[PDB]
Symmetry: D2
């Protein structure tokens, strides 16, 4: 993607694209005025020998002590070095890229007092596909990960280029840069903010959306496999409840299923025995999940565009004000909200798998295999789905309700947004595995309705899976089939079946 | 309140009023057409000897077995009796009233096929202030509590009138009624639905709103008590982040605090040392809480108006359709969302109490008492606040992520909405106790700034507390002071200070 | 019970008896030496004008400031008054009695420096059945509840006698007492300690034990009702695993079931189809629960006898030492351990109920009723059991992992033991309701095996229930049957069937 | 380690050694009788044309259908292939080795009916250091991971040798083996069992023990750094409480600290101001943790030796019995117990870090650095410790309280032991990072007490860290210091300071 960025206007679709693939960006000309004007306000404070906390002061004893020039340049470097105190595995380059772009976006709104040259150095790194090392853990909601990113600007730390670690000076040279020296306010502008928290949660959102889309297709396949009814999806039921998420979800099921299929007609008014809730309550459960993800997306899409550093520079009035926008509470809650959605998408899918395995409910052979007292079929795949779904219950415990006071009680309440967002990634792996197993089971069950077809889009879902995984004719090593179905889901194989304009970023 | 109900149009303010106090209601004339038309559709199915699941069938063996008249009347009674299988403490009358009104509202939209006479019998009970016994527990999201309510219509169960338990026949007579006999579809119309789940969560919402309002006033008092700054509330900071909850929250703080007060001016540019986050990040944390409660309120206000029984009768087309609107998933998630807000309101307040107790941070005597090596002052009240805030972490664990399959796997996924909503009530007691202690502490600390006043609305908060609880001059039995402050908060003493149009139902 | 107490030697059976019913106690003569000797050590410090923290110092500025006599008497009173800062519902008298006896026991070990006269005043209150008001909440693990108890000794607060609240002076007079004045160290000896935390957790233990016992009988009934096998209980299986809890649990099942019964013989080698895990894995699951409760009981039985105040007086060496025995961490963990046991007893029972409702698994009519397309039978009782079991998952979240720093970070890590123990009470109500429903279902199912009997002890369980609740012949109001079964379980109706010497306190 | 295994007698020290490093094992001669005798019992059933579930039956339709020879060999292979349905990252070789040895141990007790040749093939793989691929996820407590392990015996799947993946036939050849054909009962003997669950939890135990040991040394360093007292560790305090974990923990602190040190003497009766609980309540909190880990270790050490497959063969009586020993409930609870210990070790350490950063409490410069309004020192390392400690609260939510019914409700209650154990690994990473930061901080703080030494063993802890990480003289890139301290802890640098015979496996 090639982006001429109007700061503060990134959409969720643009954020998904940044998360998914490399970007080339530059600032729109309209960004220059406010960026340069907050720098000029900082420069005027210094030229006028005024003292402003977080501009030309120290910290602590010196918090309203105007320290001298000399000390102030070095102070920026000391802040980045000492604050780069994170730990844990390195983030992958896609996430590092997203964090860098979010930081560029926020700074480029012109309230932070950082030189346009420093912003353009971050842009050069993005454009060169040079990604600073950022460790996963340490932020309480994002001094440490943002300090690690910023090290490379100073010629410290390391960065990844074409999958290999480079020294910061080699990495800068790849991007056409040499090490920079920071000025007043720039250490705080780079280190204070919510961009790591927000990126972690946005990744969770995009995963939740991918899983929602796949679950509409998988659930439609499972309805067909067990001769379920389309009547639960009737628009009038959903209008009468009035829940938007459910209305839009039922509309997606109707789009994928259509009014009837060869399978449904071949079993006619089938419906003589009411469907289980894991089928018939899909609009209600998946709709609640959709509302939850939309809740979270609204908060996260704002936060991606937020001015989140401190103190803020209001050049139009000539004011520098210390507030609290670095506190990532809304991000932490958005991530905890997303956990409910990822968990319940998986729970409902796991119950549909269980239904398909139950001969009294599925109208299929037990465990979806012919010769069933000699073959186990899908029996243990169903157990794997149970294990994955169960893990998500404990993982749903909220992080936004915890806090510890850091630094002699001044940092006396924090968000825990990073932990909240990061756990969504593993929840999403769990739900993706459940859905992969459901996909496998429903395609197997439809195969056993010999020669019959489902709807146009659900046949595309069958064809996608059968390109890699064969019908289960007799017991064979099961796990490679699950692995392949998971990889197809992770690559977005089913996402394009969902109607446009339903999910926040799609 | 006197209400001429247009079904499906209840507002959150009206729901708060129903929850708070008795009501007298009647249906608007415009409700009659659809109510009577879905009854006529049911009557036409029976007159035409057609068979329709959930109208004139049995269940199970007989699910598409048109059973005879005789059996069908008795079947309604057998359903109510057998389904009234709840357990636990009786609900209070305010909550029973809310459940009854929600059921009236939903049925009166005309999609359920229940006689207007049966709806008007529920209305007569409400109007007579006769409240069926409903036990707290048993629903998985609301057959059992709604069956208990419905017993009284049949002359079974018991009901409360002027605080005393009456037999159902005495209770009906108070309301001008005699026992009714139910018709086709009416047992399911009464028992299926989400009204208990929704009422439990609405009570949680109203509590969360009450606590939000009180926390703006308490936090403003604490800012003043410790000589905190107003600069964190500056509108430009909040506009620059762009989070609506935070913008509106900072506007509330500015309204209550004003630009300056005698206390703030008497300590002038005070601000020489940055405020702790529990003060300066109030817009960010309380704003995240406000967004969360607004999230939940949107879902709950829709659900209060929802058609939530099954099967639904679409008289305009002549269709009866079985779906899943009884599944309370969105309510369960809304309640889990509210838990985050109630917990974090309390956590932030508890940190402000801790700040006030800390002589290095408060600019007040340790533990808010004079003669402090002989007097303990607020030391153990602060511990009580810690205990209450801590309990809310475990209580925040979500219920919406659990389910058990009931009835031979047909009821194979449920919401757990009742448990999700009910736990909010105790969370709210915990946060109310924390805020009561904060109120006490900040008024004590302001008293120690001898003769100085805070802003107009915050002085009203001081006066409200000091009408019941004196300045703490020397150690005395502490707990009665906490009890009185809690009761004042529970009665809404501080709610009217908040600007109108901020909280969903206010 | 009449007890001549050798301090520090209370057994779990004695603690159960104290919890269950009134007591009359006196100290054994052998207690006097150490009690009076630690008082004499305190008196010698004061006579020698020495200074000892927590004996004759203030707190804070004065922590190693020997304050004068005068101030020291008043200081004790100020501590009790200011520390009585709890909130919430009053504890019931049984729990208050247990707390008082635990405090008597701990102080009477002679390490606390409190006059024997003050200990004997607490004993007089117990013996007179006069129970101070103690509010439920406020301790973080037990200054506030122990301060509330202690108020009555000073003629403050209130106390319950024959179910009515009395002023402290009337309450003291009932016990033959007049208000006391405390001496050096006595305020801390009364207020510091773990007795409320320990009592809350002991109540949880006793409930868990009661539920374990009832669950062996209910599970044996359910095995019989569905024609399950006795082979899973064979001692050789359990010896081969080697887990003690499971060995002892299987021995209990064999004792209650016997080698065969009329029902089992009438269905002979029945066993042709393997039993579900909720039957066949009872030794494994219930055994894990038994080990967990034994874990907790070992810790709690020690803590009931612990010296838990501070500073401690070692009269034999002449030393007063400040440590940390008031920290209730081990109690908090014991309570969290008990939560796992209470939850899993309930989960396994709920699955046995579900099995009995499933015609494909139970060999009984669906929902345990004859005429089943017209009668719903136990269908909604099973839903109530699901709701109760589900609630226990969230309630199992541990409290021992939380802490907040109280009082300017000196009280910088606390246990949250009170919250951990108290939540067990509601978990136990939930599991008791599940077991009540299982009891009802299995007796109903056995009735449907017309004229057949189970084993001697399981017939006693049937007779106990059928004395209050009839066979379910046709749909009727269900809930009163659940209520009666719960009350029978709460009264210990099934406990006496379990072999002696299995459960810690039984 | 070279082991002549007496089955069923492995100690926790031996299990630690197996987990830590390669092993060479053979069975003791005394193992042969029972192994061969249960095979002969299986052979006698087949020779006698008897039918025995799980020996010579099918499953399902055929569960008491004696299927023919032919089908029975192939049935073993079909079970392994179809059951190898796990997903997720491959286990590391140390854990695979532990699982293999636990399976060898359990089978070699002679109750499973599997040929000694098959056991010796697993032994050959261990001895050759050839480790089957086992994916992390899928078991609900261990068909799938044990099926994956077993694939390699049949010449399927893959195995790791010298860090590289080999085909199963190459891997077998490395071990001197060719593919095997399984006999009656052998597929179930290999696949049923608790060895993966038990290995996952044992790894958690060993980590918890390593962290306990490191935390005694780190906490002793922190006591010294802030001039804390040794009086809290006095044996008489701990004897008077009577909790064993606390007694043994205080004895460990006394051993490492000694009666006095140069630092403690140089500050003399220092003690004039009481230490915070994070120091003075170390015996109480760490002792509760020790009891918890000992609880868990007792259960896990039994389970490592358990006969956990099914059905079991009792050759002495000639009986084959189906029970439930594959249900890993006790392991799941042991793992949840360990979570409390790992969490609270980390919480207490994080509070000691916070104490060291607080100039009002530490008697050290703020943030442990000289020149502190220009240098940030340990400020953000402390934030990293807060983040890690906080994550452990949510991760402590129990898995043993969840279950889903798998396979048409026969598998109707499961343990979730694998998830319970696996999450301990990440909890341990979190607590290890906290302790690494504490180690760094306390060594820095002691350095600032110029030229003074602590005790003999605590100086060894200082020397170990200072071999890799220098004194923090001025701000520098912080994170590499944390990384090095974590690696030293992970390698057991501090474990050998703890007295022997305290921790279960040490």
């Amino acid at each position: 993607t090639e982006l001429t960025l109007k700061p503060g206007t990134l959409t969720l679709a643009q954020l998904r694209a940044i998360h998914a693939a490399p970007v080339r960006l530059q600032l729109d000309a309209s960004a220059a005025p406010a960026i340069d004007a907050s720098v000029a306000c900082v420069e005027q404070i210094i030229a006028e020998d005024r003292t402003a906390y977080g501009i030309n002061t120290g910290f602590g004893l010196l918090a309203s002590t105007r320290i001298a020039s000399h000390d102030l340049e070095n102070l920026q470097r000391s802040l980045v070095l000492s604050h780069a105190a994170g730990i844990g595995a390195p983030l992958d380059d896609d996430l590092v890229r997203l964090i860098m772009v979010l930081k560029i976006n926020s700074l480029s709104r012109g309230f932070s007092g950082i030189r346009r040259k420093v912003i353009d150095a971050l842009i050069a790194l993005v454009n060169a596909e040079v990604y600073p090392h950022i460790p996963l853990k340490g932020s309480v909601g994002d001094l440490a990960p943002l300090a690690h990113m910023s090290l490379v600007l100073l010629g410290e730390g390391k960065a990844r280029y074409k999958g290999q670690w480079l020294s910061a000076t080699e990495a800068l040279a790849v991007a056409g840069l040499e090490p920079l020296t920071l000025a007043a306010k720039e250490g705080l502008a780079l280190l204070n903010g919510t961009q790591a928290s927000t990126a972690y949660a946005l990744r969770g959102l995009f995963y939740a959306e991918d899983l929602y889309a796949a679950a509409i297709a998988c659930g439609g396949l499972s309805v067909e496999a067990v001769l379920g009814s389309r009547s639960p999806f009737d628009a009038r039921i959903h209008e009468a409840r009035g829940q938007r998420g459910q209305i839009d979800t039922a509309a997606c099921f109707r789009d994928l299923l259509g009014d009837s299929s060869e399978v449904s007609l071949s079993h006619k008014n089938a419906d003589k025995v009411q469907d289980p809730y894991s089928l018939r309550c899909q609009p209600q459960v998946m709709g609640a999940c959709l509302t939850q993800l939309r809740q979270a997306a609204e908060v996260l899409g704002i936060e991606a565009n937020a001015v989140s550093d401190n103190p803020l520079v209001f050049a139009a009035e000539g004011d520098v004000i210390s507030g609290g926008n670095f506190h990532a509470e809304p991000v932490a809650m958005a991530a905890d909200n997303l956990a409910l959605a990822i968990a319940e998408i998986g729970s409902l899918s796991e119950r549909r798998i269980s239904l398909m395995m139950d001969k009294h409910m599925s109208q299929l052979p037990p465990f979806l295999v012919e010769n069933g007292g000699v073959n186990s079929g899908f029996m243990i795949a169903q157990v794997t789905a149970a294990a994955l779904a169960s893990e998500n219950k404990a993982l749903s415990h909220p992080h936004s309700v915890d806090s510890l006071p850091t630094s002699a009680n001044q940092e006396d309440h924090v968000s825990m947004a990073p932990a909240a967002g990061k756990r969504l990634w593993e929840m999403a792996e769990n739900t993706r595995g459940v859905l992969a197993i459901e996909w496998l089971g429903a395609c197997q069950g439809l195969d056993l309705r010999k020669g019959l077809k489902t709807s146009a889009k659900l046949e595309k879902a069958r064809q996608a899976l059968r390109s890699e995984v064969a019908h289960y004719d007799r017991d064979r090593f099961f796990a490679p089939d699950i692995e392949k179905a998971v990889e197809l889901l992770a690559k977005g194989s089913l996402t394009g079946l969902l109607p446009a304009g339903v999910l926040p970023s799609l």
